[PDB]
Design a protein around this nucleic acid. Structure first.
Ligand SMILES: [Mg+2]
Ligand SMILES: [Mg+2]
Ligand SMILES: [Mg+2]
Ligand SMILES: [Mg+2]
Ligand SMILES: [Mg+2]
Ligand SMILES: [Mg+2]
Ligand SMILES: [Mg+2]
Ligand SMILES: [Mg+2]
Ligand SMILES: [Mg+2]
Ligand SMILES: [Mg+2]
Ligand SMILES: [Mg+2]
Ligand SMILES: [Mg+2]
Ligand SMILES: [Mg+2]
Ligand SMILES: [Mg+2]
Ligand SMILES: [Mg+2]
Ligand SMILES: [Mg+2]
Ligand SMILES: [Mg+2]
Ligand SMILES: [Mg+2]
Ligand SMILES: [Mg+2]
Ligand SMILES: [Mg+2]
Ligand SMILES: [Mg+2]
Ligand SMILES: [Mg+2]
Ligand SMILES: [Mg+2]
Ligand SMILES: [Mg+2]
Ligand SMILES: [Mg+2]
Ligand SMILES: [Mg+2]
Ligand SMILES: [Mg+2]
Ligand SMILES: [Mg+2]
Ligand SMILES: [Mg+2]
Ligand SMILES: [Mg+2]
Ligand SMILES: [Mg+2]
Ligand SMILES: [Mg+2]
Ligand SMILES: [Mg+2]
Ligand SMILES: [Mg+2]
Ligand SMILES: [Mg+2]
Ligand SMILES: [Mg+2]
Ligand SMILES: [Mg+2]
Ligand SMILES: [Mg+2]
Ligand SMILES: [Mg+2]
Ligand SMILES: [Mg+2]
Ligand SMILES: [Mg+2]
Ligand SMILES: [Mg+2]
Ligand SMILES: [Mg+2]
Ligand SMILES: [Mg+2]
Ligand SMILES: [Mg+2]
Ligand SMILES: [Mg+2]
Ligand SMILES: [Mg+2]
Ligand SMILES: [Mg+2]
Ligand SMILES: [Mg+2]
Ligand SMILES: [Mg+2]
Ligand SMILES: [Mg+2]
Ligand SMILES: [Mg+2]
Ligand SMILES: [Mg+2]
Ligand SMILES: [Mg+2]
Ligand SMILES: [Mg+2]
Ligand SMILES: [Mg+2]
Ligand SMILES: [Mg+2]
Ligand SMILES: [Mg+2]
Ligand SMILES: [Mg+2]
Ligand SMILES: [Mg+2]
Ligand SMILES: [Mg+2]
Ligand SMILES: [Mg+2]
Ligand SMILES: [Mg+2]
Ligand SMILES: [Mg+2]
Ligand SMILES: [Mg+2]
Ligand SMILES: [Mg+2]
Ligand SMILES: [Mg+2]
Ligand SMILES: [Mg+2]
Ligand SMILES: [Mg+2]
Ligand SMILES: [Mg+2]
Ligand SMILES: [Mg+2]
Ligand SMILES: [Mg+2]
Ligand SMILES: [Mg+2]
Ligand SMILES: [Mg+2]
Ligand SMILES: [Mg+2]
Ligand SMILES: [Mg+2]
Ligand SMILES: [Mg+2]
Ligand SMILES: [Mg+2]
Ligand SMILES: [Mg+2]
Ligand SMILES: [Mg+2]
Ligand SMILES: [Mg+2]
Ligand SMILES: [Mg+2]
Ligand SMILES: [Mg+2]
Ligand SMILES: [Mg+2]
Ligand SMILES: [Mg+2]
Ligand SMILES: [Mg+2]
Ligand SMILES: [Mg+2]
Ligand SMILES: [Mg+2]
Ligand SMILES: [Mg+2]
Ligand SMILES: [Mg+2]
Ligand SMILES: [Mg+2]
Ligand SMILES: [Mg+2]
Ligand SMILES: [Mg+2]
Ligand SMILES: [Mg+2]
Ligand SMILES: [Mg+2]
Ligand SMILES: [Mg+2]
Ligand SMILES: [Mg+2]
Ligand SMILES: [Mg+2]
Ligand SMILES: [Mg+2]
Ligand SMILES: [Mg+2]
Ligand SMILES: [Mg+2]
Ligand SMILES: [Mg+2]
Ligand SMILES: [Mg+2]
Ligand SMILES: [Mg+2]
Ligand SMILES: [Mg+2]
Ligand SMILES: [Mg+2]
Ligand SMILES: [Mg+2]
Ligand SMILES: [Mg+2]
Ligand SMILES: [Mg+2]
Ligand SMILES: [Mg+2]
Ligand SMILES: [Mg+2]
Ligand SMILES: [Mg+2]
Ligand SMILES: [Mg+2]
Ligand SMILES: [Mg+2]
Ligand SMILES: [Mg+2]
Ligand SMILES: [Mg+2]
Ligand SMILES: [Mg+2]
Ligand SMILES: [Mg+2]
Ligand SMILES: [Mg+2]
Ligand SMILES: [Mg+2]
Ligand SMILES: [Mg+2]
Ligand SMILES: [Mg+2]
Ligand SMILES: [Mg+2]
Ligand SMILES: [Mg+2]
Ligand SMILES: [Mg+2]
Ligand SMILES: [Mg+2]
Ligand SMILES: [Mg+2]
Ligand SMILES: [Mg+2]
Ligand SMILES: [Mg+2]
Ligand SMILES: [Mg+2]
Ligand SMILES: [Mg+2]
Ligand SMILES: [Mg+2]
Ligand SMILES: [Mg+2]
Ligand SMILES: [Mg+2]
Ligand SMILES: [Mg+2]
Ligand SMILES: [Mg+2]
Ligand SMILES: [Mg+2]
Ligand SMILES: [Mg+2]
Ligand SMILES: [Mg+2]
Lengths: 99, 119, 50, 60, 206, 135, 87
RNA sequence: UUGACCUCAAAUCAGGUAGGAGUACCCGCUGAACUUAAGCAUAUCAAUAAGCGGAGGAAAAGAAACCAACCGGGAUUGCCU
RNA sequence: AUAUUGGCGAGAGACCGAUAGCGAACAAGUACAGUGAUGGAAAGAUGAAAAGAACUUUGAAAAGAGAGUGAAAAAGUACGU
RNA sequence: CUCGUAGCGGUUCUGACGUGCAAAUCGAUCGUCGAAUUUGGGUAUAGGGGCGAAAGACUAAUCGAACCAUCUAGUAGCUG
RNA sequence: UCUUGGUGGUAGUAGCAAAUAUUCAAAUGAGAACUUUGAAGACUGAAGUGGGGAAAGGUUCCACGUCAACAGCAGUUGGACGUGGGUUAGUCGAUCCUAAGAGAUGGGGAAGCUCCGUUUCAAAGGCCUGAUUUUAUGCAGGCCACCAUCGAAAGGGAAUC
RNA sequence: AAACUUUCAACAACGGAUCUCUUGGUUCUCGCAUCGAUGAAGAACGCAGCGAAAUGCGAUACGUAAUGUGAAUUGCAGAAUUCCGUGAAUCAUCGAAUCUUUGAACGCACAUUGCGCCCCUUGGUAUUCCAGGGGGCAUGCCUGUUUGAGCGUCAUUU
């Protein structure tokens, strides 16, 4: 007559994920005009290790199309992607690993 | 022996301030002497004199502000009457005696008569 | 604690100034019933609980 | 050495000493005593003798 | 109705070598661990607490009240009952003692006591104020401090000062013939109060 | 409906009190509407309310409130009764039209529980009335 | 080891002083007063706790303003002063 | 350009108002179980206790979409029945 | 007109009389216990007046023995009985 | 990984003690001792709930449903 | 196995035996196994019975006086009792920052006490002008797309020996 | 025979029953209606010539003013020509004030005596920095004011 261990998991107290050492959410770039109509070039700067994740994470810097600044996107690294490699994102990008 | 408030009401705004400063000097030197004396009951007289001087000064200041705010809407709230919060929420005598013209015509036309059962 | 709050030290000051015996002349007044200090507190006998 | 108000900072102690006794104040150090009152160690400028000022006030 | 029950006492149960009375919990006060809630406990409620809905007044049949009043009036006749009840009336010539209606208009206490002494209530009026005693018991500090005997009942038909004039005289009670309290006529349920009638009172009795 | 709060949908009493889901809330949605508007505008006095519209999730009401401190209300005898302190939060005590409707305050034989308020009626009809000379 | 050795491990505090009632009841992790309910605007008081209501109700403190209201009512909520000087 | 109108905002704008306490009694919501049934589930306890919202010196109710079926009474409330 | 173990002001009693009566007659919601919600005591009485025992002696002292006050010290603050 | 200090436990003596030093200690002997280590402080999870390398363990000497108050003077064909 | 209070016998009894350990003199004192000083003997043996701090305590610190009670013997001594004295900061801490987390607002929920949520579906914002006389500097342009606050006396942090 | 033990009495103890009191409680009746943003209830800290509490008060601090009474208060000390008096008093009454830090608690915050911003003024060679004095700065809602926003929308414009 006691609430069992899998029913206690949804209350989310001691069963939350341990998120201090993670690098951030790995997402694609936002689907904007540049990716919808052409492409955009970013740069792999670091291939780092994400805690709790078996896959390494690429940090890819793109130029902001509308302001003068840099946008750092966090990608899941594909095998063969290296630091300093240009990554192309968009409709007009080519068939290369990492694009 | 102690200042007397009725003799304080006849003084000006500057004489009472100078007497307040003088009394505070007396309190300071008496407080020095209390260290060297086992007892000193004359602390109490100067302390109540300071209280009386400040009371008279505040009476003059508040009556000056009432004469400045005299006979107009929006007196300051410390000079407004403190009765009870419900006693000043309180429809006034005018508002409680407001009567519509229909009810006023009825009240004039048919007031409660005075009568007796004798003849 | 030696690194006190001011509020803690202020209640310490009040407890220190109440830690005194009865003043002797209060036993001499007309119709006195007080014999002693029934709210006397020691550091070794009863904690003042913050 | 003074008992000062619990509301008074070192600026107010220095200003009140400076115009109650007409002295110069090199430094004011302050503690709250264990009986809950404030004590100020007011060091005077070497233009002034604290013994002379204290005998002017009326103690020792 | 909360006396003896301002406690959160529960029984400790058996096994702790104490009787199963409910006991005060907590610690440190002297009261902790002590019995509560029971009639046998110090501090507990009393057995069957008194209520305000006890019967305080008693209904009597009106005709039986009138029966008792009429028999009390008839007992204020012949003097054996008046002597047995108290009432120094051995030197009174005849019972009922009927005085003139001019008594009802006397409005001084001095003239009223002169009239009572003159028609013969002197020894009864002296029996009262020589029977004043401090009351035995705890009643003496429940606003019932002194006890004294009952004096004469002066019964009138109209009041023109006699009530107020005899108000301050100890023992003496006045009464209208329209009422005649049985508590005045047979006090302690002993028949034969000494009664002084006025002529108008005696006539109106019929 | 009103879902009974009761964690995991659980009573813990008799089977007559075990239901959670078809329980109906004795005050109307219009009364809930005026109580929430009275809390939002506590300086005003609720007067009446009326249905304006509804869909499946919500009902929509408009609530008339009167400022008892405005002098256009404090004068003009037809309305300054609302300034009496016995009319603070009429919609919280059931003194609006929907409040008296849900309290059952109506005349006649169909309302024998509720004409003077049924808790007042219950206290009258469950009081033992003893006189000095017992009856 | 649940008794005397474990009592030696009691050197923290669950409750400090309350700014509103001064009771040593401010739970420092909950930021709530156990007895008076602070920082909730309403004061904690329950009808099952009638003795606790008795400890804290109106009359148990100074009544700095309410001790004068009945005198102010008896005189009709006067304004002004009295008139004469002395004997 | 300019001038309204409607709707919506802002301001340490001018004036004002609400909160909290008390809570015996009052108007509501919400709401048990012990208990009784010699078990118990409907029932009962009880439209009660606890919980929550709102008033006043009283509150509420109140001048009939009433009671009736009489030769008819006549707002509401309370007592006797 | 009705209600009212709260508040203010009164008046009463076939009530209780310090283990009773409110928990509390008294510096009582006090002292004290618990982290906390909460729990929660005991404790009235010398004499009409302190007149509360000057003074001598023994003892380091407490104190004793005397003396003395007092109607009473078979009332000496550890005090009516 | 191992022998073994500190530490952290708690095998056996079924030793001492058993109106104790102690409502769980004392002594010897033991397990482990570089990590699923030990620990402070901060923080989160609250009672049919929590938390559990799982013993119905533990949740302030309280646990096969904590503690406090109220309902409640619960009821008892049973005992004094 | 009543309640509260008081009192017995047991009974001058069980006991006051862990942590190696005391002893001689003088002084003080009415009184010294136990106080002070000297002397000797020992122990902790630097993961200390040493020197400091954190939590907690709260004056226990120190001096003077003093022994009715307390220090399960004693006491002239005391963390006891009575009376005072004592805690000094630009540089040490707090204060500030964020952490796991807590939490307002906007808004939605809930009969309601209140719940959710923490940048969300909000019209959420205040900063320099390049340096001065029509300027209490603004009635000038111009920029920032960030979004309460609390949260560490062991983390980060301006500066003293 | 003592001691011892037991019983009884007297005296002395222990203990605090009994009795007798009672500025308390309880119950009934009667009358009245008055808390708070003009800051309440409640809390903390302080305040007296010698006070720990109770009671009272708030840096004007067992109180100030005002009024009535008319000579106290006191346990000591002090002051008491002020005492046929605008005048003692821990007096009564109470209409004027003060009312620390708080608290619904209101610039923000609070396990901090923590950090701001605005106005006036003062000091430091200062519109900007530092300091002191005084006054402000919460939220929701109503009426109004002013400034606005929306091609929501109407007239008017070479
Ligand atoms: Mg569970
Ligand atoms: Mg569970
Ligand atoms: Mg599972
Ligand atoms: Mg997470
Ligand atoms: Mg008011
Ligand atoms: Mg502090
Ligand atoms: Mg200790
Ligand atoms: Mg300092
Ligand atoms: Mg036994
Ligand atoms: Mg008992
Ligand atoms: Mg009792
Ligand atoms: Mg009792
Ligand atoms: Mg009859
Ligand atoms: Mg006469
Ligand atoms: Mg007698
Ligand atoms: Mg008698
Ligand atoms: Mg009697
Ligand atoms: Mg008697
Ligand atoms: Mg008797
Ligand atoms: Mg009586
Ligand atoms: Mg009497
Ligand atoms: Mg009497
Ligand atoms: Mg059922
Ligand atoms: Mg259901
Ligand atoms: Mg009305
Ligand atoms: Mg209506
Ligand atoms: Mg309803
Ligand atoms: Mg019915
Ligand atoms: Mg109803
Ligand atoms: Mg009712
Ligand atoms: Mg009935
Ligand atoms: Mg009757
Ligand atoms: Mg009947
Ligand atoms: Mg243990
Ligand atoms: Mg345990
Ligand atoms: Mg904690
Ligand atoms: Mg507490
Ligand atoms: Mg509490
Ligand atoms: Mg509150
Ligand atoms: Mg309480
Ligand atoms: Mg309390
Ligand atoms: Mg404004
Ligand atoms: Mg309210
Ligand atoms: Mg009620
Ligand atoms: Mg109702
Ligand atoms: Mg029952
Ligand atoms: Mg039944
Ligand atoms: Mg049954
Ligand atoms: Mg049965
Ligand atoms: Mg059956
Ligand atoms: Mg059963
Ligand atoms: Mg029912
Ligand atoms: Mg009922
Ligand atoms: Mg209820
Ligand atoms: Mg509820
Ligand atoms: Mg009211
Ligand atoms: Mg009425
Ligand atoms: Mg009405
Ligand atoms: Mg109505
Ligand atoms: Mg109609
Ligand atoms: Mg009919
Ligand atoms: Mg009718
Ligand atoms: Mg009836
Ligand atoms: Mg009938
Ligand atoms: Mg009586
Ligand atoms: Mg007795
Ligand atoms: Mg008692
Ligand atoms: Mg008692
Ligand atoms: Mg008491
Ligand atoms: Mg505990
Ligand atoms: Mg505690
Ligand atoms: Mg303890
Ligand atoms: Mg006695
Ligand atoms: Mg005598
Ligand atoms: Mg002798
Ligand atoms: Mg003699
Ligand atoms: Mg005698
Ligand atoms: Mg003699
Ligand atoms: Mg003698
Ligand atoms: Mg005697
Ligand atoms: Mg290993
Ligand atoms: Mg090994
Ligand atoms: Mg072992
Ligand atoms: Mg063993
Ligand atoms: Mg080993
Ligand atoms: Mg092993
Ligand atoms: Mg191993
Ligand atoms: Mg190893
Ligand atoms: Mg290894
Ligand atoms: Mg913590
Ligand atoms: Mg938890
Ligand atoms: Mg449950
Ligand atoms: Mg277990
Ligand atoms: Mg429990
Ligand atoms: Mg029962
Ligand atoms: Mg029994
Ligand atoms: Mg027995
Ligand atoms: Mg006992
Ligand atoms: Mg004994
Ligand atoms: Mg012996
Ligand atoms: Mg022996
Ligand atoms: Mg032994
Ligand atoms: Mg040894
Ligand atoms: Mg010697
Ligand atoms: Mg020896
Ligand atoms: Mg030697
Ligand atoms: Mg060695
Ligand atoms: Mg020392
Ligand atoms: Mg000594
Ligand atoms: Mg000893
Ligand atoms: Mg000794
Ligand atoms: Mg010694
Ligand atoms: Mg010492
Ligand atoms: Mg000392
Ligand atoms: Mg000292
Ligand atoms: Mg530093
Ligand atoms: Mg922060
Ligand atoms: Mg929240
Ligand atoms: Mg919503
Ligand atoms: Mg906080
Ligand atoms: Mg911070
Ligand atoms: Mg830090
Ligand atoms: Mg770090
Ligand atoms: Mg640090
Ligand atoms: Mg820093
Ligand atoms: Mg009563
Ligand atoms: Mg205030
Ligand atoms: Mg207040
Ligand atoms: Mg308090
Ligand atoms: Mg004072
Ligand atoms: Mg005092
Ligand atoms: Mg004053
Ligand atoms: Mg006076
Ligand atoms: Mg007075
Ligand atoms: Mg002031
Ligand atoms: Mg005040
Ligand atoms: Mg802050
Ligand atoms: Mg902080
Ligand atoms: Mg508006």
């Amino acid at each position: 007559g006691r609430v069992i261990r899998n029913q206690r998991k949804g209350a989310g107290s001691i069963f939350t994920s341990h998120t201090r050492l993670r690098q951030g959410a790995a997402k694609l770039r936002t689907l904007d005009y540049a990716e919808r109509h052409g492409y955009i070039r970013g740069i792999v700067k670091q291939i780092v290790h994400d805690s709790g994740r078996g896959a390494p994470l690429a940090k890819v810097v793109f130029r902001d199309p509308y302001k003068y600044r840099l946008r750092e996107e966090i990608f899941i690294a594909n095998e063969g992607v290296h630091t300093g490699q240009f990554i192309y994102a968009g409709k007009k990008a080519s068939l290369n690993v990492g694009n | 022996a102690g200042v007397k408030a009725y003799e304080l009401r006849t003084k000006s705004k500057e004489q009472l301030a100078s007497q307040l400063v003088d009394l505070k000097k007396e309190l300071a030197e008496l407080k020095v002497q209390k260290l060297s004396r086992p007892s000193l009951p004359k602390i109490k007289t100067v302390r109540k004199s300071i209280a009386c001087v400040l009371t008279v000064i505040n009476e003059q200041q508040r009556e000056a502000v009432r004469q400045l705010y005299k006979g107009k809407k929006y007196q300051p709230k410390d000079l407004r009457a403190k009765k009870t919060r419900a006693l000043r929420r309180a429809l006034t005598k005018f508002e409680a005696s407001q009567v519509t013209e229909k009810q006023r015509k009825k009240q004039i036309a048919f007031p409660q008569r005075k009568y007796a059962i004798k003849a | 604690a030696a690194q006190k709050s001011f509020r803690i030290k202020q209640k310490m000051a009040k407890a220190k100034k109440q830690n005194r015996p009865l003043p002797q002349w209060i036993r001499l007044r007309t119709n006195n019933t007080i014999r002693y200090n029934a709210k006397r507190r020691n550091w070794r006998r009863t904690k003042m609980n913050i | 050495v003074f008992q000062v108000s619990m509301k008074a900072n070192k600026y107010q102690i220095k200003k009140a000493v400076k115009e109650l006794y007409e002295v110069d104040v090199l430094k004011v150090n302050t503690l709250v005593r264990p009986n809950g009152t404030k004590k100020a160690y007011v060091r005077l400028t070497a233009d002034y003798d604290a013994l002379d000022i204290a005998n002017r006030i009326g103690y020792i | 109705e909360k006396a003896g029950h301002q406690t959160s006492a529960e029984s400790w149960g058996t096994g702790r070598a104490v009787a199963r009375i409910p006991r005060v919990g907590g610690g440190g006060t002297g009261r902790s661990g002590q019995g509560a809630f029971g009639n046998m406990c110090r501090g507990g409620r009393m057995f069957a607490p008194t209520k305000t809905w006890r019967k305080w007044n008693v209904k009597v049949n009106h005709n039986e009240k009138r029966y008792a009043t009429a028999s009390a009036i008839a007992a204020t006749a012949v003097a054996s009952l008046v002597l047995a009840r108290g009432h120094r009336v051995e030197k009174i010539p005849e019972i009922p003692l009927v005085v003139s209606t001019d008594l009802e208009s006397i409005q001084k206490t001095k003239e009223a006591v002169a009239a009572l002494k003159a028609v013969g209530a002197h020894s009864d009026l002296l029996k009262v104020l020589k029977s004043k005693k401090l009351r035995a018991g705890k009643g003496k500090y429940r606003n019932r401090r002194w006890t004294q005997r009952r004096g004469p009942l002066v019964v009138y038909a109209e009041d023109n000062g006699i009530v107020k004039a005899l108000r301050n005289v100890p023992g003496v009670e006045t009464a209208n013939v329209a009422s005649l309290n049985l508590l005045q006529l047979a006090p302690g349920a002993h028949l034969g109060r000494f009664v002084i009638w006025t002529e108008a009172a005696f006539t109106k009795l019929d | 409906n009103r879902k009974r709060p009761v964690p995991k949908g659980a009573t813990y009493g008799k089977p007559t009190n075990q239901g959670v889901n078809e329980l109906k809330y004795q005050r109307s949605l219009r009364a809930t509407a005026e109580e929430r508007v009275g809390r939002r505008a506590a300086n005003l006095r609720v007067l009446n309310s009326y249905w304006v519209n509804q869909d499946s999730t919500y009902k929509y009401f408009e609530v008339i409130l009167v400022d008892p401190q405005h002098k256009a209300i404090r004068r003009d005898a037809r309305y300054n009764w609302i300034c009496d302190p016995v009319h603070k939060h009429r919609e919280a005590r059931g003194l609006t039209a929907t409040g008296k409707k849900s309290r059952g305050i109506n005349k006649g034989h169909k309302f024998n529980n509720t004409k003077a308020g049924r808790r007042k009626t219950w206290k009258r009809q469950n009081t033992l009335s003893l006189w000095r000379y017992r009856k | 080891g649940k008794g005397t050795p474990s009592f030696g491990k009691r050197h923290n505090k669950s409750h400090t002083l309350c700014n509103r009632c001064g009771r040593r009841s401010f739970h420092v992790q909950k930021k709530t007063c156990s007895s008076c309910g602070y920082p909730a605007a309403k004061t904690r008081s329950y009808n099952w706790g009638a003795k606790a209501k008795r400890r804290h109700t109106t009359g148990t403190g100074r009544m700095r303003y309410l001790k004068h209201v009945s005198r102010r009512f008896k005189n009709g909520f006067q304004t002004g002063s009295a008139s004469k000087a002395s004997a």
